[PDB]
């Protein structure tokens, strides 16, 4: 079993990605996944409010094996804040944690402010994994979780 925490500014789609993956709908939780030689259980921790209650970050993310740090591709501030979220994960967890940086809302194509290239560069700069998703369209949501699960 592996504790996976979702992190990111308000309104980026942290809950929506979990919903889409767990229930396949769009408006902790346990999910078992089957890998070639392994079978593992992900515990998906989601919360609102963390950007307001910063001092709770260390304890909320305490024993995480993975952190999925989400921004909204139409919202530059949400992308800029992901360095801060990732620094919170490293401070608490060191290198004992898989991190996936996620640019969500790819279906809002005409409102995009962060190109896929800038997301990829930030991920490479910080040595984390990267993907883009649409929770609404269901694009790359299963890919996100299968890559994280394979890396654990």
Ligand X SMILES: Nc1nc2c(ncn2[C@@H]2O[C@H](COP(=O)(O)OP(=O)(O)O)[C@@H](O)[C@H]2O)c(=O)[nH]1
Cβ closest to ligand X, residue 40 vs residue 136: 136
Given the structure tokens 């490479």, which residue do they identify? 124
Partner whose footprint covers residue 20, from ligand X, Mg ion, none (CB < 5 to 8 Å by kind): none
> Is 11 known as a binding-site position?
yes
The nearest distance, CB 96 to ligand X, in angstroms, is: 25
Tell me which residues in 57-116 interact with ligand X (CB under 6 A).
Answer: 104-105, 107-108
Stretch that binds ligand X, among 10-18, 82-90, 95-103, 143-151 (CB under 6 A): 10-18
Cα–Cα distance for residue pair 82/7, rounded to 1 Å: 9
SS3 string, 59-118, reads: HHCCCCCEEEEEEECCCHHHHHCHHHHHHHHHHHHCCCCEEEEEEECCCCHHHCCCCHHH
Interface residues toward ligand X, by CB under 6 A: 8, 10-16, 104-105, 107-108, 134-136
């Amino acid at each position: 079993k592996f504790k996976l925490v979702f992190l990111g500014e308000q309104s980026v789609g942290k809950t929506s990605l979990i919903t889409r993956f767990m229930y396949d709908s769009f408006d902790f939780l346990s999910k078992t996944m089957y890998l070639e030689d392994r079978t593992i259980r992900l515990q998906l921790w989601d919360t609102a409010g963390l950007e307001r209650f910063r001092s709770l970050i260390p304890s909320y993310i305490r024993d995480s094996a993975a952190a999925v740090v989400v921004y909204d591709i139409t919202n530059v501030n949400s992308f800029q804040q992901t360095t801060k979220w990732i620094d919170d994960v490293r401070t608490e967890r060191g290198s004992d944690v898989i991190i996936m940086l996620v640019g969500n809302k790819t279906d809002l194509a005409d409102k995009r402010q962060v190109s896929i290239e800038e997301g990829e560069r930030k991920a490479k700069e910080l040595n984390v994994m990267f993907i883009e998703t649409s929770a609404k369209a269901g694009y790359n949501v299963k890919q996100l979780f299968r890559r994280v699960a394979a890396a654990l």
